[PDB]
Amino acid sequence: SKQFFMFGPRDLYRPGETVILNGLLRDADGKALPNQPIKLDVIKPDGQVLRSVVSQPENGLYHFTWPLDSNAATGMWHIRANTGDNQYRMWDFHVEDFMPERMALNLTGEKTPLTPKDEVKFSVVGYYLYGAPANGNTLQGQLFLRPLREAVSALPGFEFGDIAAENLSRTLDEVQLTLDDKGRGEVSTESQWKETHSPLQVIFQGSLLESGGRPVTRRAERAIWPADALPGIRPQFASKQPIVDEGSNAAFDIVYSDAQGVKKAVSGLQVRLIRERRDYYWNWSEDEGWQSQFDQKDLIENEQTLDLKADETGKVSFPVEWGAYRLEVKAPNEAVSSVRFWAGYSENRRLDLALETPAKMRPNQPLTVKIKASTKNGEKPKQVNVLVSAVDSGVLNITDYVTPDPWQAFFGQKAALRFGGDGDELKRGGKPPVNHVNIVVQQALPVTLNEQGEGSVTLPIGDFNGELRVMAQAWTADDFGSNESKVIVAAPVIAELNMPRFMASGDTSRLTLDITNLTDKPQKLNVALTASGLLELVSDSPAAVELAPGVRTTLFIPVRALPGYGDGEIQATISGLALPGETVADQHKQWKIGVRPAFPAQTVNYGTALQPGETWAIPADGLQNFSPVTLEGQLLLSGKPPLNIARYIKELKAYPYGCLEQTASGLFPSLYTNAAQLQALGIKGDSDEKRRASVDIGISRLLQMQRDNGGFALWDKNGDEEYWLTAYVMDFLVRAGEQGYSVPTDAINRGNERLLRYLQDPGMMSIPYADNLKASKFAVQSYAALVLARQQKAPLGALREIWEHRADAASGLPLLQLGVALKTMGDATRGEEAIALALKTPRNSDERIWLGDYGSSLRDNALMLSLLEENKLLPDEQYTLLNTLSQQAFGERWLSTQESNALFLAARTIQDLPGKWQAQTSFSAEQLTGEKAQNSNLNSDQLVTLQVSNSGDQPLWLRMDASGYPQSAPLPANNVLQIERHILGTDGKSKSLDSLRSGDLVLVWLQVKASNSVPDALVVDLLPAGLELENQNLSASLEQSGGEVQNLLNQMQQANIKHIEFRDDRFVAAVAVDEYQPVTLVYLARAVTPGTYQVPQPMVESMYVPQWRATGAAEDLLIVRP
């Protein structure tokens, strides 16, 4: 069937850096195949496809590299491969803003389960990867105590421990340790879970802290039991908490087991079926927090006893009746295990490979590797190809990169639119500062070994301190194998600096300079320090130093971070160790950091449209407010539509039922479209047969609301006549037949002859609720005019008489109706006048005055437009009216079904019409053109002088958005939506920001709420350099079992969140936010660098309309001491 081994130097890249992917193709057997290509596709987190290739193989091997984009979205990416099979093999790989480790951490306890009173202790082993051990490096940690449910790891499905056991999950005392011992340190706890009859586990999450700096954090787990062996329960039912369907019986498998020791036996196991009545709940809103929930009582329903012999899988079954139960087996010894359920709601041909490699080496000189393959024979069958890569070991430990082993790869068995042009999610938050961390990765060419299975590569190594990992893979046509080797690289004396990931301009940190002697002879040096760029030394370093062999002591370097955006640098010139051996006298080192401002960027949004020959320039004072260094702009130049938010509304279906307006407004648009247009208009209403069939129904239904005199009532033919709707209804019924519907003849006639008497004798007409009868009656008369006029049944005489009562008119809509009525029956000169008047008559938009036309400024335009499309009239105004209608989009909070339709009927127009635009620009002196709509990115200098001029036959529409850091902290700006930031502790209680020592964890609470529905929201919490997010997307490093106050976690879980990114300087969340609905975001961070840091304001924006943003309230300064 074909098997494709995908493999690479690593699975953790970092936005910016090039990716390497390798491939080998074999069959079901694992033998070679005929030479062929393999389509590879690169896949972004969301699901889209960045790029794709047809990888040709050179010499049995597939290779694929491509440069991962600086602003690429952090997530998990995939490369997948079509093997013609139409099953895609995926190669997953991480992209995160990540920091290679520079240290290691082994933590162990023996794997034997303890007993209740047995204290718990763990091993610690702190060691820098250049060789040295953490001598005196402190260690933060947290000791948790969590229920251990799947204790028998050879019987997953069986659950162990009393599911209702009070207080089983606690977070025990915090860990704190100098580990002065060059080797190590140790961590114990005394038992406090005497009581339990349930199997528990103690969990240690430990962080080994670099010198005034980052953590390298790992967790160890140490099981705990209460008996020799424990009772187990597997509920037979599935699909989660498991439950019986109805009042059916509760099927269970039941057992008794040792640590893994299968099936030990005792009789007298007391099985019970406990039920839980839960009544009473809630608490006053504005309790702060809000509400609370139910209390319960537990009563027994069976006391059935079951016996069990060794190797026996018990089986109890019990009928139940619609409540929350739980099954609770009690062992003689006293270990209990409950489980809860609710009845309702709510072969060796591998090639032996060995690697000749130094155990240790200095940097800057090539690393030579030699490869010999035993082949499990005298000599290795055919040609030996070997590919060999080298990777900084601190990169592979975060992923825990198992080296790729081809052998067991072959033989190893048993989304429509957001609007975010790519990539803007960052851009709007503001250019991130540039992160200079350098990753060390080399891959060699594939080698063909000799006839003795021997060969050698030389991987040139640069300036580096730490462990390397050499890895190699080998293949013949039929045989495969691999191996890895750990090659330390150090200097005679290491000096590596410690910095935060960035610094906000104004921030001040105290960088630590690690410096270790690996020479054996004591040495005396002078570390002369310079700082240039947007970074300056505040004070004066210790001049000279002195060290024994194998000892490091650090220097502290305090640093004012200068205003602006760019890069700062620290130069060390290190004098000493002038050598007749190493051939050296001095050594110069450089280190660089990114400086950005301390507040989030802003954006500005212009949109207009230009009929040919018009020119759009940009305001002079419009960008006046931004820092130009970091300002960029988009300029989408669509030639087909306006705002065109055909969506932002829907689904749309046929509702034949209800009163007369429900019914009419229910069907009125279903006349004019079908599934086709709909599943292509990005919305789907009704099966095409269900729509027609459902119109047919509402027709015959309306007819029965037709009174004798031919006009209509709301519910029955005996109803009080409703005047304006009688017109409306007819309009529908007339239109109906033109769209292939059957309307009875006279029914329509009885109605028309009535509509006439709407023109001739308004005296009869009495409108029930509405005032301004003058205007209400006029509006009625003109709708009735149109309708009859379409039929050629609107007598030119009566159209005049109403043409002079025109001063009564409230809206322009009637006039436009009456213009077209006139136009069509003769007398175009009144028509043209009545029309041309209509267009310059607006409605007062307070509209509580209630005229009985169900209208508004909003729809009467949408209809005045939907009219002109029909008659092909005054197309110049058509754009004008359309553009004014576009702008009813800001005012799209709660539209009626009449405004919806009347819009949708104007909107369905846009779909077909092209398209074609042409325009001159300030930039690209060439004529820009396009079939569709095209974006164009602009820098500061381009856009400050930006002008755009149409050049074509059609009008175009241009949107621009421009984003960059301002000169000065935006004052807190609530608009549409808004945002609070609260720094909670680890114990869930607001933390004094001045109270922070390094290594401390902190919980950040973002409450985001809105007055609209804003589905393209963008949360962007910038950071104070003091903090660094503890990334979860990864993790071998740190978790939200750590987070105690679930109040909020639970909430977060509900919210519709497209993605959360954890990035060097920014918390970023794309999300949908609503009214009546807050959106709780919580994210875990740590304080690393000591100093005093400016806290940005938290912000959020709507992607589509940037004017919808909320700069939240600025917090005070963050101070970190140690």
Residues contacting residue 679 through CB under 8 Å, at least 6 positions apart = none
- CA-closest candidate to residue 864, choices 850, 847, 848, 882: 882
Rounded (10°) angle between helices 723-738 and 773-791: 20
Pairing state between β 466-475 and 480-489: antiparallel
Counting beta carbons within 10 angstroms of the beta carbon of residue 103, is it exposed (0 to 12), middle (13 to 18) or buried (19 or more)?
buried
Asked if 301 contacts 347 with a C-beta cutoff of 8 angstroms, the reply is no
The experimental technique used to determine this model is X-ray
Sheet (strand 103-108) strand order: 103-108, 120-128, 185-189
- CA-closest candidate to residue 327, choices 257, 195, 237, 234: 234
Q: Which helix (H) or strand (E) holds 1046?
A: helix 1046-1054
- CA-closest candidate to residue 970, choices 607, 632, 605, 604: 604
Residue for token digits 């091993």?
Answer: 123
Asked if 787 contacts 730 with a C-beta cutoff of 8 angstroms, the reply is yes
Asked if 961 contacts 622 with a C-beta cutoff of 8 angstroms, the reply is no
CA 962, CA 185: separation in Å to the nearest integer? 55
Pairing state between β 447-448 and 480-489: unpaired
- CA-closest candidate to residue 641, choices 909, 314, 355, 302: 909
What does the block give as tokens for 901? Answer: 């339709």
DSSP per residue over 501-544, as a string?
S-EETT-EEEEEEEEEE-SSS-EEEEEEEEEEESEEE-S----E
What does the block give as tokens for 448? Answer: 């063909």
Pairing state between β 928-930 and 996-997: unpaired
Residue for token digits 């187990």?
Answer: 232
Asked if 55 contacts 38 with a C-beta cutoff of 8 angstroms, the reply is yes
Determine the 3-state secondary structure of 1121 from DSSP: strand
Q: What is the distance of C-alpha 453 from the center of its chain? A: 50
Asked if 467 contacts 394 with a C-beta cutoff of 8 angstroms, the reply is yes
Residues contacting residue 337 through CB under 8 Å, at least 6 positions apart = 159, 160, 161, 162, 198, 230, 231, 232, 233, 328, 329
Residue 1091 bridge partners (DSSP): 509, 1120
Per residue, the 3-state secondary structure of 660-724, as one string, reads HHHHHHHHCCCCCCCHHHHHHCCCCCCCHHHHHHHHHHHHHHHHCCECCCCCEECCCCCCCECHH
Q: What is the distance of C-alpha 332 from the center of its chain? A: 51
Give CA angle at 758 (705, 838), nearest 5°. Answer: 110
What does the block give as tokens for 607? Answer: 């949109």
Q: Which helix (H) or strand (E) holds 919?
A: strand 917-921
What does the block give as tokens for 559? Answer: 């640093």
Show me where the domains of the chain are located: 1-100, 101-227, 228-345, 347-414+439-491, 492-600, 601-643+912-968, 644-911, 969-1122
CA 339, CA 150: separation in Å to the nearest integer? 12
CA 865, CA 873: separation in Å to the nearest integer? 10
Determine the 3-state secondary structure of 624 from DSSP: coil
CA 210, CA 439: separation in Å to the nearest integer? 18
CA 200, CA 189: separation in Å to the nearest integer? 14
**Residue 621 DSSP code:** S
- CA-closest candidate to residue 253, choices 337, 310, 314: 314
Determine the 3-state secondary structure of 818 from DSSP: helix
Residues contacting residue 931 through CB under 8 Å, at least 6 positions apart = 639, 914, 915, 916
Backbone angles phi, psi at 669, to 5 degrees: -90, -30
Amino acid at the residue 766: S
Pairing state between β 1099-1102 and 1091-1093: unpaired
What does the block give as tokens for 440? Answer: 């060390």
- CA-closest candidate to residue 405, choices 24, 1, 82: 24
Residues contacting residue 992 through CB under 8 Å, at least 6 positions apart = none
Determine the 3-state secondary structure of 265 from DSSP: coil
CA 57, CA 80: separation in Å to the nearest integer? 16
CA 493, CA 385: separation in Å to the nearest integer? 39
The residues after which the chain has a C–N gap greater than 2.5 Å are 239, 346, 414, 1034
Asked if 510 contacts 1092 with a C-beta cutoff of 8 angstroms, the reply is no
DSSP per residue over 42-73, as a string?
EE-SSS-EEEEEEEPEETTEEEEEEEPPTTPP
CA 502, CA 531: separation in Å to the nearest integer? 15
Residues contacting residue 609 through CB under 8 Å, at least 6 positions apart = 642, 879, 883, 955, 956, 957, 958
Q: Which helix (H) or strand (E) holds 990?
A: none
Amino acid at the residue 300: I
CA 393, CA 1118: separation in Å to the nearest integer? 34
Cis peptide before 936 (omega within 30 of 0): no
Counting beta carbons within 10 angstroms of the beta carbon of residue 709, is it exposed (0 to 12), middle (13 to 18) or buried (19 or more)?
middle
CB count within 10 Å of CB 663 equals: 23
Q: Which helix (H) or strand (E) holds 155?
A: none
CB count within 10 Å of CB 341 equals: 19
Asked if 1046 contacts 1030 with a C-beta cutoff of 8 angstroms, the reply is no
Determine the 3-state secondary structure of 472 from DSSP: strand
Asked if 49 contacts 81 with a C-beta cutoff of 8 angstroms, the reply is no
CA 252, CA 335: separation in Å to the nearest integer? 18
Determine the 3-state secondary structure of 879 from DSSP: helix
CA 42, CA 589: separation in Å to the nearest integer? 38
CA 656, CA 667: separation in Å to the nearest integer? 6
Backbone angles phi, psi at 302, to 5 degrees: -140, 145
- CA-closest candidate to residue 953, choices 925, 976, 919, 927: 919
Q: What is the distance of C-alpha 560 from the center of its chain? A: 35
Q: What is the distance of C-alpha 821 from the center of its chain? A: 54
CA 486, CA 182: separation in Å to the nearest integer? 22
CA 679, CA 974: separation in Å to the nearest integer? 38
CB count within 10 Å of CB 366 equals: 11
Q: Which helix (H) or strand (E) holds 110?
A: none
DSSP per residue over 1010-1035, as a string?
ESS-EEEEEEEEE--TTEEE--S---
Resolution (A): 3.7
DSSP per residue over 320-384, as a string?
--SSEEEEEEE-SSS-EEEEEEESS-----BPPEEEE--SEE-SSSPEEEEEEE-TTSSS-SS--
Give CA angle at 838 (837, 844), nearest 5°. Answer: 115
Give CA angle at 696 (690, 702), nearest 5°. Answer: 130
* Dihedral sign for Cα atoms in the order 753, 758, 760, 761: positive
Per residue, the 3-state secondary structure of 943-963, as one string, reads HHCCEEEECCCCCEEEEEEEE
Amino acid at the residue 1119: I
